[PDB]
Design a protein around this nucleic acid. Structure first.
Lengths: 101, 78, 96, 91, 97, 79, 103, 93
DNA sequence: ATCACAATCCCGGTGCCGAGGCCGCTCAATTGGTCGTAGACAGCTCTAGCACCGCTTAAACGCACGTACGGATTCCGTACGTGCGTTTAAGCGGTGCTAGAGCTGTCTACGACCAATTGAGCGGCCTCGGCACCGGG
DNA sequence: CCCGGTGCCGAGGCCGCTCAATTGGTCGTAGACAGCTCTAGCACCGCTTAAACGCACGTACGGAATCCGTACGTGCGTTTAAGCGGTGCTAGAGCTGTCTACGACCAATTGAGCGGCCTCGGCACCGGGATTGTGAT
């Protein structure tokens, strides 16, 4: 059975292990549970972003998640806002008209 | 000069997007200088990245690497 | 029939804060990037995706800077932004 | 051949939302997003290994890298999911 | 009673403290504050003295930079006295939450 | 109390080093809040670095690494 | 006969090489002419900061570079200020008072 | 419990530029940390730059491009000049 | 303007820790020689970037007009600044004690590798269903 | 801004090929570990000057108010060049092959850089005239 299946994760445990070997150590070893933990973390973060974006898309009544929805969901949640400080192509801005105006 | 290609309505449109109600007439030259400096930095970094790979075409990945170097990582273009 | 300041400004603010389209004519910006890079290395080429990425980054940068400048100007009990506000935002951010 | 995280995102999406698909541009956005998070975790784990002079990268390096990178409740819940995966995998 | 004019002694203090390089907090209260902060994160900790010394250096440099930004914000609004609102604007412009 | 220990004259000296000539009456509590937030932010990482080494002593290097993580690299306590 | 002497530097080529190989990724290799470049770069940067801090010290008529002189040299040049963004311990600040406060 | 540091070479450079001006142990710690930080930055950039081009060897080209990427204008020019001089001297022997 | 007066700069002696020099020695830079593999040099093809033409037509642009808004002026009220008599909690200094960092000598569990299999993961393709611009109220 | 009409290109499922994920036997090796030593973190007292704290007090300062002059916003008519489309053409980004030229591994070895010990000289702490901005006249 696949290492992802044994770990109960949809992400590739073997490929993530290979990437960790080829990108993360000078000359040394990568533990087998290192790949499992990394894949679980990636799965969790992606699942959270996907759930928030899907909620936004459903609020906007559309069946496809688009960069506008991703931007809305990312800026909406405080933790995701602090974790992701990047620019999203075709994402727009969140409306905010100042009171003094 | 092509820095004038950033027409007054373009700067006004960016300002409106940012939430600016009124705009002084001297804002436009300041914004043109700001944009020129930012472009110069990013383009220098991307050109160095391209020249490292012995190349004559500046792809999107070079631009993304240069943008990430300055702390302005951009998603969805490579 | 006319309007007064603050009406069309807010209308444009709403109309442009909801869309996702680019706010610079693409050909003038492309000419600008080619002229700027005409000094680092002569006889240079570009890619469509490269220039599009540069434009997206520049637009995001300038919108953020205008947000900071608007905050700086509203601080001084004002509505009109001036070069002093931009210079304050860029000095506090460390961009100079 | 160009490697991608296009699967494992369609699957996660079709599990969180059994009825919502995703476009092709948003797919690039999330490929880059997962790549960025992976890069950050890998770099922090390497730096921790260099700090404490352990040649190998264990699950503890990943745990501390997650705790340093992710903030607050995100860090707590991610750590919980990783520990659950490790405990299930060992058995 | 010489009774210097209000404002002419603050400039002398400004000169004196910008000429000196020592630390500007009593060591014992900052040590106690660091202990009280680090207590809740994990109990029964122990600190190398250089840990607290480095933490104090970092805190003082951070606060000095923040006050310079606040002074710029105050001078912006045609003022002389820094205020809480200027501190908040400084901490918002530079992104610090 | 342990936060009033950063006294009003101490905040005044820190302000003076920054070039401040007049100080409002509410600056002190705001600066105390700022300092508490900053110290919590850095110590939350210093204690994590210490815990990862199965230690009880928070060596200077844990603090220096934690500071470098937040983008405030400090010279003179490591190397 | 040492590598750094062959390159005509003061920084060690050998130790810098060994420290390089401890940082390259798995199966990574370090050319023997990468350590030469890195040693030359480090020597140049240190020489620049040292010249600046030495001049700042001879301004005050002393013989010992201290944290104060390093901060005064770092913040007194635009290049080093941009490159070095650290917190020199015990360096104080640069004395400068605005004009909207002076009577 | 041996500990290695860049102190001897720092002292040699300092005596090269300022023969009759000394340095304090606090400044020696400062400069130890400065050399360590700059070397780490350059090495990390060189490693990533080798990785992007699908390489494994970290050549002087990678170090040159890393210096060009993390050093301001005139500093970059002079540093690259010094490094090139050193490399063409080394290859001679 | 001219000046008493607190405060600052400017030299001077002193003795006290720290910078800088000097040996001992252990660790690690360096010399030499396999072999092997990553990388430079030569070809090929076809992808995609540069260039020219013509329409058209949506955005920029220049002038006219008036009003809201930023800047100077005036007036007080009070909340920061100065100086002082007094107290409280830091700063050393010495003694006492020991938890926990730090090195070592074993050794025993995990991880890299190789031969072979095979099963998931990308490039094609073949469509139908979310969608974006209409056009109107 | 809020419901339809419509023709579409974009997303997704089926398909065959390929390349790397999965067993499985070595096997060298790194970190868990128990033990021991010894530094340095912590605690307790005692004096001793000094920074903090509270209070009296009068001046500069932030903040509201009034008032004109002007310079940004809004509208209109007329350019004007950006955006599409169509066709030509070729310059080099990307894949393949071949051959070699540097960088890794191993053994012996020798000098360079740490650790400790020691000494004078530079920095600090301060006393005494010199002079310098302040504030009331």
């Amino acid at each position: 059975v696949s290492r992802s299946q044994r770990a109960g994760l949809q992400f590739p445990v073997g490929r993530i292990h290979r990437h960790l070997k080829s990108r993360t150590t000078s000359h040394g070893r990568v533990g087998a549970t290192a790949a499992v933990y990394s894949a679980a973390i990636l799965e969790y973060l992606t699942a959270e972003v996907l759930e928030l974006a899907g909620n936004a898309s459903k609020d906007l009544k559309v069946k496809r998640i688009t960069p506008r929805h991703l931007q809305l969901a990312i800026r909406g949640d405080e933790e995701l806002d602090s974790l992701i400080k990047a620019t999203i192509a075709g994402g727009g801005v969140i409306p905010h008209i100042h009171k003094s105006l | 000069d092509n820095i004038q290609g950033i027409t007054k309505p373009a700067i006004r449109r960016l300002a409106r997007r940012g939430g600016v109600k009124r705009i002084s007439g001297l804002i436009y030259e300041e914004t043109r200088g700001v944009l020129k400096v930012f472009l110069e930095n990013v383009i220098r970094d991307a050109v160095t990245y391209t020249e490292h790979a012995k190349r004559k075409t500046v792809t999107a990945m070079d631009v993304v690497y240069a943008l990430k170097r300055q702390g302005r990582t951009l998603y969805g273009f490579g | 029939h006319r309007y007064r300041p603050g009406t069309v400004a807010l209308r444009e603010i709403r109309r442009y804060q909801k869309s996702t389209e680019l706010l610079i004519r693409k050909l003038p910006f492309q000419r600008l990037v080619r002229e700027i890079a005409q000094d680092f290395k002569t006889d240079l080429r570009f890619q469509s995706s490269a220039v599009m990425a540069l434009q997206e980054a520049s637009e995001a940068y300038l919108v953020g800077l205008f947000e900071d400048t608007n905050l700086c100007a509203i601080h001084a009990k004002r509505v009109t932004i001036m070069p002093k506000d931009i210079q304050l935002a860029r000095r506090i951010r460390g961009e100079r | 051949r160009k490697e991608s995280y296009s699967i494992y995102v369609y699957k996660v999406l079709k599990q969180v939302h059994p009825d919502t698909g995703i476009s092709s541009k948003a797919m690039g956005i999330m490929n880059s997003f997962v790549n960025d998070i992976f890069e950050r975790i890998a770099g922090e784990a390497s730096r921790l290994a260099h700090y404490n002079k352990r040649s190998t990268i264990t699950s503890r390096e990943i745990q501390t890298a997650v705790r340093l990178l992710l903030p607050g409740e995100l860090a707590k819940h991610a750590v919980s999911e990783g520990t659950k995966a490790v405990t299930k995998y060992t058995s």
